[PDB]
């Protein structure tokens, strides 16, 4: 159940170099007698949060930063606090990428886009429109060939399209992302989406196709080409083919957008090895040798550390990923990212299979990507769970004396008076009170981190409020006060 002490356990996904990672941490165990196990699960960016939430999971997870917000509001990682000297080895919009509430939540590594990938002897002059596909494709038809595989079943690879002519995710305002201003489904996101399936319908690309299908079917020679990062070209290079990376195609005039993902390495919260994975990540990790043997095993793309990417920017498919890069912009890593990967993703399975129309299937995947997290429906519910047990000692003081209250400006002392981060009290002043009613109020301890009160009167009716002034370090044994945006809970 427990992290073993003395020891380091990674996560890393099983697209990156973990054999690479593996020499280092055998380089880390040579001099510190400190044993590094690098794993690679299935899904383990849905293991981490609900391992990791018991005390349990690795000692260090690696994942793109759009996933270490939502891994900060569960509290499931170490802060990080590099010295000066430290920091100033890594680009700083990379440190910006994984700082999270003021506060640094993860190493930054590498710094990953999608590039057009593509057959030089089949394409030596590959399109630089996405409009002329379906004509190559036809062309490549007649050849036994086809024009274009990606993977259909990430939005990830299709999102360059979506966002290019308007489509975005969260609106930056006033100083944050604005989770009520989603860009899912707005005039420019449908025309990329639409143009997605519009190949789809005609036969220039099949719904199904996923990362394995187009992967063997670029690096056979089938496709002539396909969309993909950094961590691809290994397998490619083991291939015949001769390839080039280039810019991404532009859709109505403008270049395709792809979100820049930098994969950063975070420190389990409940780590008893806190010390030594900063050690094996500062110091082992974060030096030219060390990128370099995970480089050589899967390229990294782009990396933080200065030193390194001066070699690695001579490369010219680093270069194309820069410029790629360059058109795209860096995802945020709030925690409302999940919500909204989710969404878009049934949305092009969606469309891309005809079960929804663009419109249909992307008006849900707006409403989707903007409603409760499953962070703040897990809260509520465990918050009410804790009022519910204070309403039956409310109950139960009633029976034993006739009214709520402990005397005419007094109430009660609650058994649950800490919850889920959450303070509880009675809501109201004790005095002029009646007698056979009461309110429960639950307020954040945090409430940058859970911004909403709840509250519940005597026979359980709950709403859930956005807008309150209340604190729990109010000093005071009750809450008083009116609450705003306000809705029922259902
Ligand atoms: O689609 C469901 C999927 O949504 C979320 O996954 C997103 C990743 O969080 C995001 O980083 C990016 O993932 C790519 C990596 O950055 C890249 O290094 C490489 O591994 O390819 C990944 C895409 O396959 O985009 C995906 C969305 O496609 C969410 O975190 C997942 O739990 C969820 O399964
Ligand atoms: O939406 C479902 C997807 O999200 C999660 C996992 O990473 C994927 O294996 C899964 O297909
Ligand atoms: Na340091
Ligand atoms: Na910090
Ligand atoms: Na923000
Ligand atoms: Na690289
Ligand atoms: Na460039």
């Known amino acids: 159940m427990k992290i073993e002490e003395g020891k380091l356990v990674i996560w890393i996904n099983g697209d990156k170099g973990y054999n690479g990672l593996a020499e280092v941490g055998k380089k880390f165990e040579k001099d510190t007698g400190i044993k590094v196990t690098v794993e690679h699960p299935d899904k383990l960016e849905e293991k981490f949060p609900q391992v990791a939430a018991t005390g349990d999971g690795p000692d260090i997870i690696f994942w793109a930063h759009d996933r270490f917000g939502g891994y900060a509001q ?4 170490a802060e990080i606090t590099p010295a000066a000297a430290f920091q100033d080895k890594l680009y700083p919009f990379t440190w910006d990428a994984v700082r999270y ?24 002059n590959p399109p630089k429109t996405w409009e002329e596909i379906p004509a190559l494709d036809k062309e ?3 050849k036994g060939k086809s024009a274009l595989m990606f993977n259909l079943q990430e939005p990830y690879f299709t999102w360059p399209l979506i966002a290019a002519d308007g489509g975005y995710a969260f609106k930056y305002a006033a100083g944050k992302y ?21 190949l789809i319908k005609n036969k220039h690309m099949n719904a199904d196709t996923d990362y394995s299908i187009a992967e063997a079917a670029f690096n056979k020679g089938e496709t002539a080409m396909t969309i993909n990062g950094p961590w691809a070209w290994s397998n490619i290079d083991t291939s015949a083919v001769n390839y080039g990376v280039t810019v991404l195609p532009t859709f109505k005039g403008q270049p395709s957008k792809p979100f820049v993902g930098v994969l950063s390495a975070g420190i389990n919260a409940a780590s008893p090895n806190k010390e030594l994975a900063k050690e094996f990540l500062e110091n082992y990790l974060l030096t030219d040798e060390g990128l370099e043997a995970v480089n050589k095993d899967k390229p990294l793309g782009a990396v933080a550390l200065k030193s390194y990417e001066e070699e690695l920017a001579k490369d ?21 990212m999940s919500a909204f990967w989710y969404a878009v993703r049934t949305a092009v399975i969606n469309a891309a299979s005809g079960r929804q129309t663009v419109d249909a299937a992307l008006a849900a995947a707006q409403t989707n990507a903007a409603a409760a997290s499953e962070f703040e ?17 409310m109950e139960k003081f009633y029976l034993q004396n006739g009214r709520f209250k402990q005397t005419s400006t007094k109430w009660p ?10 303070c509880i009290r009675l809501n109201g002043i004790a005095r002029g009170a009646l007698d056979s009613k009461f309110m429960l109020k639950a307020v954040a301890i945090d409430k940058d981190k859970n911004p909403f009160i709840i509250k519940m009167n005597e026979n359980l009716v709950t709403f859930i409020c956005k807008k309150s002034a209340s604190s729990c370090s109010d000093g005071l044994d009750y809450f008083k006060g009116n609450d705003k945006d306000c809705k029922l809970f259902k």
């Not at 604005?178 to 143009?195: H, P, Q, S």
């Not at 429906?377 to 000692?393: D, P, Q, S, T």
Request: hydrophobic share 50%; no cysteine; glycine share 8%.
């Open 101 to 124: 509430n003021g506060k640094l939540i993860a190493y930054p590594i590498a710094v990953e886009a999608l590039s057009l990938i593509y057959n030089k002897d089949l394409l030596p």
């Open 413 to 422: 002392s609650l058994p649950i008076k800490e919850a889920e981060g959450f």
């Open 178 to 198: 604005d989770i009520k201003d989603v860009g899912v489904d707005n005039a420019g996101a449908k025309a990329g989406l639409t143009f997605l399936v519009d």
């Open 74 to 77: 569960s509290g499931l990682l």
């Open 377 to 393: 429906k897990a809260k509520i519910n465990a918050v009410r769970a804790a009022l519910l047990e204070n309403a039956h000692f």
């Open 316 to 336: 010219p498919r680093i270069a194309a990923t820069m410029e790629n890069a360059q058109k795209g912009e860096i995802m945020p890593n709030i925690p409302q």
């Open 140 to 142: 490549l038809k007649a």
